[PDB]
Symmetry: D2
Subunit: 274 residues, 4 copies
């Protein structure tokens, strides 16, 4: 299986290939004066099974680039194409919240099911979006890797989910840290943060409001060292400054989405799903 | 038939709807903090035949927005969707110019043939790209409209094609202006521009080199008033300044692609293909 | 006086130069792979008075490009540089609306007063921003040109200002059309739109809310043909579709800011201020 | 001294403030629908000495945001403003390489000398650009930090400069690693890479050509494990894939410019220059 680098996951694809002990295929990527995408599989392809690793921080670019790469691979003999989109865009919702709307992941799943034979993604917000796919839809979990990153720097912490929705992430991390866990309902449903270290974990941190809010409160409830972790560090605008001011000790994310805090890698997580 | 506005052809869709004497459907368009596209058919849809008019100056955005709109329309009863993409992106080439490459229009034609029942575009560069579509692929010609715009301001002009490839545009315009026509082979193959007005016409002007070059020469051959027209005024970077300096009297384009010179409309041209 | 084209006003600079019957200076503009701006006065400069015409739709790019061009001109002998920024960015506000804020036009006026000897702009939102400049700050009015564009297509119209703030624009246009004028206070303060054509005029239309609102109401008060005009057609997102749906007959703007409806030119207006 | 976060160095500013054991000032940053920048010092400012830490990956945005922040700080009592621009844009060249050009750093130095009292940057390409400033121009070196990152994973390596220009970086790292050093002149001027680990170090890696070239050759000369480090990991387009394919063991950069490999921090380096 050759590893094909998408323009948005060049380091992750490299790390994965290294783990798979596979030669990393040279993929040419550039923009015409138009700004149209130009892709090109430079190395010669003998193998007939490729794995495209291209996350979607720049959503529409990732979609088109992937479409073009698949065409290029098929036109070169590749029989099976697996797409690894660490961060999958347009997959936040399950349905319409208003008449006249579209179900974006539904429309894209149709295209994916036609151009690739398998799709892998890390920590999707909605697990049910797979119902729209007619090809294998595999999802890995990076929460364990985040937990392993902090057990090293927190003293008998309480693992909190920013809301009930993220309770599972807290539980997962909770098990790895041998700590208690709960979720803010505003305050934790059961536990008390007075004089305790806290590990707030969620799948995404965009705006930072939900997070910054939890932190300010927890600090008021006498929380000690607080670390906020997320799988997809979207961190829009001044999100990071917002969290730091609220008083977090540190914010950490993974490399599914490029940020100033993408410290943890999902390479191993991806390798296991291959 | 309801007219559905794409975010990139709001004025053109309006002009078309007006000609079709149809009520223009209100379509909500915005970006999430993510910068992901959000679309929404606000007005209620009774009719089951819609026409999406969305050009592709911002290529990847147009492709994704179109995909989302089709999903939204289908999920609302629409049985037939016709896509009008005045300027169609990724359709410049017919095949590969290097191994390992993709045929972009081939890959996209597959998606188009699946989400829409008919595709209309104005002055494609390559007429053969239609072979990749499994749905009706209609193309209109806006050259006649450009010709009609200049017959008013040129004195017994010579219609020139920047190269042999664009000879047909020159011939088309030539007929409407009752003028002679030729093409640069560098100099015109047969005609002579000494003391004559010139109408240079092509389908696209990106960089401006081909054009600027023709103009400087023609000026040297004693050409008088020179007007340069194109259907898709891509005019990248300093393209316009380049042409003006070379000495053109005026540059004019259509509204298939937004530019500072998109003076001619293709609304009527589109209405006739519906 | 040589005319120096900014990358954002290539057509306007051309039209102005033509009116001034001056040879248009060839100005090289491109982006490094970095995406850093590269400018270059190609033609040789003998004259020592230049006029830079560069509007600021892409705000920060226009500011830096202008700074670089001034340096390039000075380093070439130019003694007097006049900057024409049809649309001037960061000049919407007069002061702070919250502690800790900045007065953006104040900070930029300082830079302008240092790199250019004169600044010209069309229809500023706040006339008092000139108090921050220590160089001549001239502003032209394009409303008369908008009025002249519609008198041709409205039957004894009522000229309305979207709000009291824009009453002067309505009055100006009103005089040219020999029509009555008023302003919405929601409804017109004095006049009545029952069975009447309406010319809504303002300096800017961004979001379209203020406008779309006025149109829907006016339609309800039995307004007939409604035309909405603005000097700076910012028209963000689905603004145009919003207005068309509300029922406007047409939206028209000038070429100070590129839009799908920048029909009226401010070239003559600029030429008179030179 | 309060630390003021720029929107582009939120993590670095945090790390620096933490080292300076200073409370990190909350700075509001957002975009108007226009896309114009909005900044706001939220926390109250008592101290009258601030340090702005805002790198310039997005060049023109950083320049304008900095200008606005300075205005906001002055208007709030701050007497001394020090600007830390880890990566300083438009400072690559010392002079003109063609008539009609500008000296970008010269034009910007004028603005900097007027809005800030001190400017700090990390590893400038051209040390002479300081001659254009009329305020203190301090530059720190992050090469030592890169060297410290690799001594851990290279076996008695040869430190190479991609060209003569970068010989000093190689020498600096060379000292810290107690290794020999040289520079490609194509091949090393003196040393021989046969059966040896290699540490290629430069200040910047944009396109990757210079680098990828050196790596392919070195591999041919029988080089073993090769690590490529740079201070500013601009890594445009498919730069990383290019290097990985050439055969580098790893590419590492600092956090002056956000990339998928910004592993080393310059926080300490900055703290020492304060």
């Amino acid at each position: 299986m050759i590893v094909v680098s998408g323009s948005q996951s060049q380091n992750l694809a490299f790390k994965v290939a290294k783990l798979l002990n596979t030669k990393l295929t040279r993929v040419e990527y550039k923009r015409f004066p138009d700004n149209e995408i130009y892709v090109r599989i430079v190395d010669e392809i003998n193998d007939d099974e490729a794995v495209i690793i291209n996350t979607q921080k720049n959503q529409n670019d990732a979609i088109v680039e992937t479409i073009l790469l698949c065409d290029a691979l098929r036109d070169e003999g590749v029989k099976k194409i697996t797409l690894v989109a660490p961060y999958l865009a347009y997959a936040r919702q399950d349905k319409k919240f208003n008449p006249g709307e579209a179900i974006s992941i539904r429309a894209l799943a149709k295209i994916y099911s036609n151009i690739v034979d398998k799709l892998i993604t890390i920590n999707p917000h909605e697990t049910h979006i797979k119902d729209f796919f007619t090809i294998p839809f595999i999802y890995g979990d990076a929460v364990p890797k985040l937990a392993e990153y902090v057990k090293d720097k927190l003293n008998d912490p309480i693992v909190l989910a920013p809301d009930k929705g993220a309770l599972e992430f807290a539980k997962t991390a909770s098990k790895i840290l041998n700590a208690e866990y709960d979720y803010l309902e505003i305050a934790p449903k059961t536990l008390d943060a007075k004089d305790r270290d806290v590990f707030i974990v969620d799948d995404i941190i965009s705006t930072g409001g939900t997070m910054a809010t939890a932190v300010k409160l927890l600090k008021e409830q006498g929380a000690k060292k607080i670390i906020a972790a997320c799988v997809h560090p979207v961190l829009i605008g001044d999100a990071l400054n917002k969290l730091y001011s609220a008083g977090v000790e540190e914010v950490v994310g993974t490399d599914t989405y490029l940020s100033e805090v993408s410290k943890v890698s999902v390479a191993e997580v991806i390798v296991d799903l291959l």
